[PDB]
Design a protein around this nucleic acid. Sequence first.
RNA 1: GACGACCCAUUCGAACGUCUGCCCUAUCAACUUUCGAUGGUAGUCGCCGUGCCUACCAUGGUGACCACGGGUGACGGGGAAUCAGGGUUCGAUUCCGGAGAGGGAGCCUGAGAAACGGCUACCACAUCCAAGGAAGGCAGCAGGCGCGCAAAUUACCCACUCCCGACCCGGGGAGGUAGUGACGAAAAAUAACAAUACAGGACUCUUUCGAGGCCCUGUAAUUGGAAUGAGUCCACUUUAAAUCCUUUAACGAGGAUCCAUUGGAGGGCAAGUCUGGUCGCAGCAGCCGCGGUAAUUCCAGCUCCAAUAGCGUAUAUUAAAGUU
Lengths: 54, 142, 173, 126
Amino acid sequence: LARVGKVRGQTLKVAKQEKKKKRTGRAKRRMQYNRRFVNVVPTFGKKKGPNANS
Amino acid sequence: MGKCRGLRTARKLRSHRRDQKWHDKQYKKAHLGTALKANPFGGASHAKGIVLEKVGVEAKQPNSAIRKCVRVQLIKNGKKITAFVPNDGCLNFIEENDEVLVAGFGRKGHAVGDIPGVRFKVVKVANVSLLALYKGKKERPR
Amino acid sequence: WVCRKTYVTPRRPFEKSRLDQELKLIGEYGLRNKREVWRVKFTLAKIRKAARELLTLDEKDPRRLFEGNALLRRLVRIGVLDEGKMKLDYILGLKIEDFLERRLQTQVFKLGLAKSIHHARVLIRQRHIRVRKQVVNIPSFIVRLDSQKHIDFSLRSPYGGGRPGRVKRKNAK
Amino acid sequence: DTVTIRTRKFMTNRLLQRKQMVIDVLHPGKATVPKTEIQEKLAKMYKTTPDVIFVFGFRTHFGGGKTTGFGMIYDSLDYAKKNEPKHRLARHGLYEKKKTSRKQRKERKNRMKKVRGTAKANVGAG
RNA sequence: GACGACCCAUUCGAACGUCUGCCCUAUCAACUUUCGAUGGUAGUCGCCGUGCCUACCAUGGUGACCACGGGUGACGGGGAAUCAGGGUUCGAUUCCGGAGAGGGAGCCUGAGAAACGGCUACCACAUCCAAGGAAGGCAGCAGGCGCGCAAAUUACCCACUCCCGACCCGGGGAGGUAGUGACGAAAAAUAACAAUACAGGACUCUUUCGAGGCCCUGUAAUUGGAAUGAGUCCACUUUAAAUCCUUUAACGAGGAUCCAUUGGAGGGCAAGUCUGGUCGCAGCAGCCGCGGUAAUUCCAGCUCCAAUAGCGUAUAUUAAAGUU
């Protein structure tokens, strides 16, 4: 149990690398503005966050 | 309060403050220079040495682990420093009797975390970073 | 030689309240980064500091007169302040948003020919506008009051007279 | 194209025997034309003929539409040929340089230094 | 007109002298004197004033208002970083003053030097030699070795700016120009617009359902029209000659590529009680703490968050510290 490389050398290695190109600079802020505030969805008090994979 | 507020007491103020400043811990290390003489560093951010031999270092309770450090002698002092090695499997990328580059933890004098007796870590083996060795965007140059 | 910074960073690294204001402000005007925001706010807070001196100086001190008179002229010349005001107290009533109205890309959209603000910035950079006789490529022109009645498209462009682009003449060939 | 030559702050510079102005030029759909073409037009605006005219400068602003330079016009040839920095005369040829690169001078100089009486070998001979 | 010379004045200075201003240390409190310490008298010397030096004579001078001694990774100042007010820290380094050219000493020339791109000697180095002798000092520009955590071309040129000479003409690694350059600073691209398609709010139309709808919105599907420099590149221009920049031919965008990364997602602190693997092992963790088979913190995948042509890490230091 002194052995190193243990946890990293017995884990599976997988990927699903992107084909889709993400935006930079201006447009990345444009989407951030619209998706949060100018949609306009919000409803009754909730905890949701901008992520939820629950 | 409880002290002079004269108009001609500049001497009694500026000589008192110059004495009671030495009771501060920080000030007393900076200006005596005993810091420099005692440290294995010259005040330099990094330093370079040559490996002596791998070791295993036990953890302080509650935590129990073996932490796989090294022990190193320096180029320019010849004295010995015990240095941590970062992420999993990076120990293997350090080979005995080669040069390394060391660096402090980020607490600037004191032992960090649950590992005692270690005050230094390792960043580059031989002009190549632990990152690129670990991630696999570079290979051993030998 | 001589160099200095034109912006400062916020003291707090994160703060839910702050970030939303900086985000939504950037959304309206099509700005690229917060560095384009903090730039404005440095200049403003500088002007707010100079004004804050002169109000505490004696009334009818010669220093206070000559500075204020020539200062307020400059604020009126760019059009962030009116001459129906014309005193130092209204400097402190000035705020961030009034500047941004006088930006080039804002004035293209507001008083000229554009779609959404995101379009208008691209037109400035792709050399399809001029300011009186002179091509520009800088959306941060900040535009003097007199020059608002000379904003026109360019005289060599496919927008108005001048040679077509390489999408049209390609398809012609 | 059709281009305009336009004056700007003339001086009758009697001491050097010349007339110096600015060469302010407008070009409509082009800009940045040869300097040779420019001095032709200035030849037939003061009738001084184009071999005593000399011009230089001519940086072109963004988007074209204007270019601005600096021009001299001498009364006679010999007043130019005397005064004139050499490279401006050689700019439209009548003079050259040689001489010859750089270095071959210094290495010869230090060799000439170490002889006395006769240095005619080193001046021709190495 | 040119040159030279004596003196006076002038200019550029040079040299001494006045008053005030200094970092740490008392586990440095008494210091200085015939090996002149302080003063008097006369003389020598020197460009001159003067214990500068010598003879004779006196016994003074300095200190708890910190002398004397020791230390300084101490050249000084004009300044720099941070900063409400008051401060703190740094100043090798482009301007000004000073000191020094391997370490010491002596000296020639000159108006000016105790000169080192002058000389002589000793000491420490190192080179050539026919062994008799001879020659040397990169803290000048480049360049090499060494030292280290740590730093560029043995490039081009007197055209600019100035200096030197008997000189309008000569010379200058001063200086200018280019190369290397993510120390650092300023500017601001990496897709904008319609069609269809779903989707939403005011609306308004309807009892509601539902439908329309333009101010919108993303989001799918393909596209369509339109635009531009990134690059490639003739010409002009630039300049000492050229590069770059600006200016202009001709090629140059359908998103699969003409590809944005660096860190983070338990709390402090903006963002996952998602999925797989590991099971106090391996590792993470500035700090508090995570891992003992159901891990929101480890190793990976997906998604999300922050800043962005930048971001992370180590160390010195300031603010936070009314914890000097």
